Amino acid sequence: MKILFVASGSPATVFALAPLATAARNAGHDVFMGAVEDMVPYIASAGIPALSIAPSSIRRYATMDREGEEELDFAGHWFGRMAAGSMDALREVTANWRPDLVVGGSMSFAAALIAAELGVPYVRQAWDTGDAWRTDPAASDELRPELRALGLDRLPDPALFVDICPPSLRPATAPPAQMMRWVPANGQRRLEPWMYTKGNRPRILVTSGSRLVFAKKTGFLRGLVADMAALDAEVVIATLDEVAEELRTELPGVRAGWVPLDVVVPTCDVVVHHAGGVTALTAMNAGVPQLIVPQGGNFVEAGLRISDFGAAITVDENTPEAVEKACGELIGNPSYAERARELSAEIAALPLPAEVVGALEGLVENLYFQ
Amino acid sequence: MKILFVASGSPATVFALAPLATAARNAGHDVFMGAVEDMVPYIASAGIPALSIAPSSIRRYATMDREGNPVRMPETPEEELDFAGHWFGRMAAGSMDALREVTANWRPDLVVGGSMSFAAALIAAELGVPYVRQAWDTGDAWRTDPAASDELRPELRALGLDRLPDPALFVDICPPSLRPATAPPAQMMRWVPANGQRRLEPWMYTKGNRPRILVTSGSRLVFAKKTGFLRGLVADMAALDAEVVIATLDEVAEELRTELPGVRAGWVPLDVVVPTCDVVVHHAGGVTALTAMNAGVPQLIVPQGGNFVEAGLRISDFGAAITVDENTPEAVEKACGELIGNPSYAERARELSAEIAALPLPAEVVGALEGLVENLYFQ
Numbered sequence A: 001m002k003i004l005f006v007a008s009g010s011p012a013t014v015f016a017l018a019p020l021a022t023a024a025r026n027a028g029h030d031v032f033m034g035a036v037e038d039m040v041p042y043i044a045s046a047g048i049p050a051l052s053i054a055p056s057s058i059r060r061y062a063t064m065d066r067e068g069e070e071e072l073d074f075a076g077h078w079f080g081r082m083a084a085g086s087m088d089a090l091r092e093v094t095a096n097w098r099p100d101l102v103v104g105g106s107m108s109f110a111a112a113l114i115a116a117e118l119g120v121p122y123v124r125q126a127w128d129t130g131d132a133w134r135t136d137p138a139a140s141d142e143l144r145p146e147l148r149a150l151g152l153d154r155l156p157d158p159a160l161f162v163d164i165c166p167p168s169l170r171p172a173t174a175p176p177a178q179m180m181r182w183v184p185a186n187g188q189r190r191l192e193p194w195m196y197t198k199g200n201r202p203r204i205l206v207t208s209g210s211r212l213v214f215a216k217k218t219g220f221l222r223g224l225v226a227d228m229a230a231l232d233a234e235v236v237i238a239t240l241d242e243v244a245e246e247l248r249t250e251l252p253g254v255r256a257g258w259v260p261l262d263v264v265v266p267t268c269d270v271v272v273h274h275a276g277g278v279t280a281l282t283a284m285n286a287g288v289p290q291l292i293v294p295q296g297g298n299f300v301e302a303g304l305r306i307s308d309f310g311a312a313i314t315v316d317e318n319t320p321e322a323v324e325k326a327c328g329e330l331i332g333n334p335s336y337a338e339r340a341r342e343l344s345a346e347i348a349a350l351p352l353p354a355e356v357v358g359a360l361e362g363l364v365e366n367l368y369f370q
Numbered sequence B: 001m002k003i004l005f006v007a008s009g010s011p012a013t014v015f016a017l018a019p020l021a022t023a024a025r026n027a028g029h030d031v032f033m034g035a036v037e038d039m040v041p042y043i044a045s046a047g048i049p050a051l052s053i054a055p056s057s058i059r060r061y062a063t064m065d066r067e068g069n070p071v072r073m074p075e076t077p078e079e080e081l082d083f084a085g086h087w088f089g090r091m092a093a094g095s096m097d098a099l100r101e102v103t104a105n106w107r108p109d110l111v112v113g114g115s116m117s118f119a120a121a122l123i124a125a126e127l128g129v130p131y132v133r134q135a136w137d138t139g140d141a142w143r144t145d146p147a148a149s150d151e152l153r154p155e156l157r158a159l160g161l162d163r164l165p166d167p168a169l170f171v172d173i174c175p176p177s178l179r180p181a182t183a184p185p186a187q188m189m190r191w192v193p194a195n196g197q198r199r200l201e202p203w204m205y206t207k208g209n210r211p212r213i214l215v216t217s218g219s220r221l222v223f224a225k226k227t228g229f230l231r232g233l234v235a236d237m238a239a240l241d242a243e244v245v246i247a248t249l250d251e252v253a254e255e256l257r258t259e260l261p262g263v264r265a266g267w268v269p270l271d272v273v274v275p276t277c278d279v280v281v282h283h284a285g286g287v288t289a290l291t292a293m294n295a296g297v298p299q300l301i302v303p304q305g306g307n308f309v310e311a312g313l314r315i316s317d318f319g320a321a322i323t324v325d326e327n328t329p330e331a332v333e334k335a336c337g338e339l340i341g342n343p344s345y346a347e348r349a350r351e352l353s354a355e356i357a358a359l360p361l362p363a364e365v366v367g368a369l370e371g372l373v374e375n376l377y378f379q
């Protein structure tokens, strides 16, 4: 069958959907994936046919409205405006290539709208362990004109929710879902021996994710690397190649640039990040403790669940003393790695993406979730 | 578990292994794939961790032997088999130094190799781990094993072996109607396309009112640079009321665009465009042949040597293709008219598509790979 995947404005949203999209292609289905114009090379390099569904300028809707608790409301309205700006290209593509099913990420609201316009089932796939649905009332408010055309009062419930959240981190209030084993599918490069080999010292990976807006604030990574000086540890910076250069001149002896996280994370004692959900999943999957230094965003609450479970530490304040002490604890106290391995085991026990493709087939053949 | 995939010197060898490698990654395994240095961007753009296992200069082994002496170009099918076994055998020998360096730091539990990725057989034996051979097309690549075993006698002698060892498992993608009767026993697999991707444009997935003919010479730079092959074939289709599209490397396309007014030329993901085509015209490329058969599209094979000619003749004998005997414009235009006009060719191609579809999925084959490693205690 024809399956349309709808990703968003950041590389992690492509990476989060690539296992289910490649699992569907491997089952013989015709799969296309769409995203913002500058995310198209990430889709193509994940080995998926790539569609541009919005110009890169649509990120202006993060600081502007359609006329020209707060974090939840803001994200719902931002992703809503991004969904609204993606409809023209999605309608043009689907008039020529009509999908039998549409799969969208957590906040890829245009997937919900195009599926309803086509009269085909809509599948929502969680792109992290955060509550995929917390931003829906704000998104429904933003998309009231598109929803009104379909005679809808709010975003419609998906025909199926595919969740990757392990049971120990899943809230009591979480909607029913087809569970799935999350697997990494991040951007790849030519591997160098340091990426898959470790030395005698513990290895600390520091990252601020794959969004250019976050990665450009190099002071965040520079400060975190400086905080680890007292530790006898090797520090590796995983960041965009476009911003790495500036970091290389400022920090001699520290590797900085794109390193496939799935390759290097199993060599790390600690993963230090900005509260990025897909980086959090990569660490949990490899049984690696993590240090979360929240820089706002909508994953902070879900990151606190990982900390409460004991597979991480969320620092109360970004101070050098708090960062170095937490890193020492994550390396030194074996309970953190023990809890991370328990989360890895929970993820491993969930249905494989190949098995979830069977649920999608059954859904389209009107056998399942009827 | 850790699984090492070993591809070869052309992008099609990467594409042929990408479904099983991605299916193993999707099952939670740690998967690395290695190839010659200039094939590394194709592995990385298939979304797989990429290793360079040989310098691009290793391709000198197609024209020189290990003693540095010139190698005669094959002139017969028997000579083509011998030549390919020795050429791939030499490339395997030249890949061992880097494979030994990588596997000393990252020890795979299993090694998967393509049809003639003989270094996969050698590194698996050196590591004492199971070796899986995956067919990269419907051709009988095992027929080059005696010539490859002769070439690799020094590496085999070190392991106390008299010939290349039998794989622990052979994974074959050849549909039953095209599979020869003593093919070795195999775990069958449904082949799926995994070719290099690009930003899609509407012409790629939409068709016009005229039949669409796709012409290609594959993904090897050495063969793609001979643009006269594609130019001649496009000129042969002038009398047909048809849209002609050239699928070729971006690096060689401009020449074809200036020489052929109104004809699109460049990299187009074959899996996307082939379902819009009435005919696929090619040089006897096995992965292009599988892409056409999978989509139920008739094909015109214009053999240019190589080890797929005999397998291409089986597709022609089945009736899902025409192999031209004489490469004249008259033969090419007549065969194209027949492939478009006679519906029997497309119905045979659809029968081959149905046979491929009935085979075990790559996700199911990953289970067979796990079973080889999991049952090691019981031999």
Ligand SMILES: Cc1cn([C@H]2C[C@H](O)[C@@H](COP(=O)(O)OP(=O)(O)O[C@@H]3C[C@@H](O)[C@H](O)[C@@H](C)C3)O2)c(=O)[nH]c1=O
Residues within 6 Å of the ligand: A010, A011, A012, A013, A015, A016, A127, A128, A186, A187, A207, A208, A209, A210, A211, A214, A237, A238, A239, A240, A257, A258, A259, A260, A261, A262, A273, A275, A276, A277, A278, A279, A280, A282, A297, A299
């Ligand atoms: C810089 C860098 C990144 N990556 C990958 C790892 C991961 O797959 C992704 C980074 O995602 P992350 O969770 O760090 O955050 P972000 O890039 O900001 O993604 C946003 C925010 C997340 O909280 C949410 O889960 C994403 C879907 C979108 O990019 C690599 O593999 N190597 C690298 O060097």
Ligand SMILES: Cc1cn([C@H]2C[C@H](O)[C@@H](COP(=O)(O)OP(=O)(O)O[C@@H]3C[C@@H](O)[C@H](O)[C@@H](C)C3)O2)c(=O)[nH]c1=O
Residues within 6 Å of the ligand: B010, B011, B012, B013, B015, B016, B136, B137, B194, B195, B196, B216, B217, B218, B219, B220, B223, B246, B247, B248, B249, B266, B267, B268, B269, B270, B271, B282, B284, B285, B286, B287, B288, B289, B291, B306, B308
């Ligand atoms: C030029 C071009 C190529 N491709 C893909 C299609 C196919 O996956 C591959 C081309 O492979 P093909 O079977 O045409 O032949 P070749 O590139 O010469 O590969 C050699 C010879 C084959 O007979 C053998 O099956 C391969 C494993 C190696 O590249 C595309 O998707 N789009 C393109 O525009």
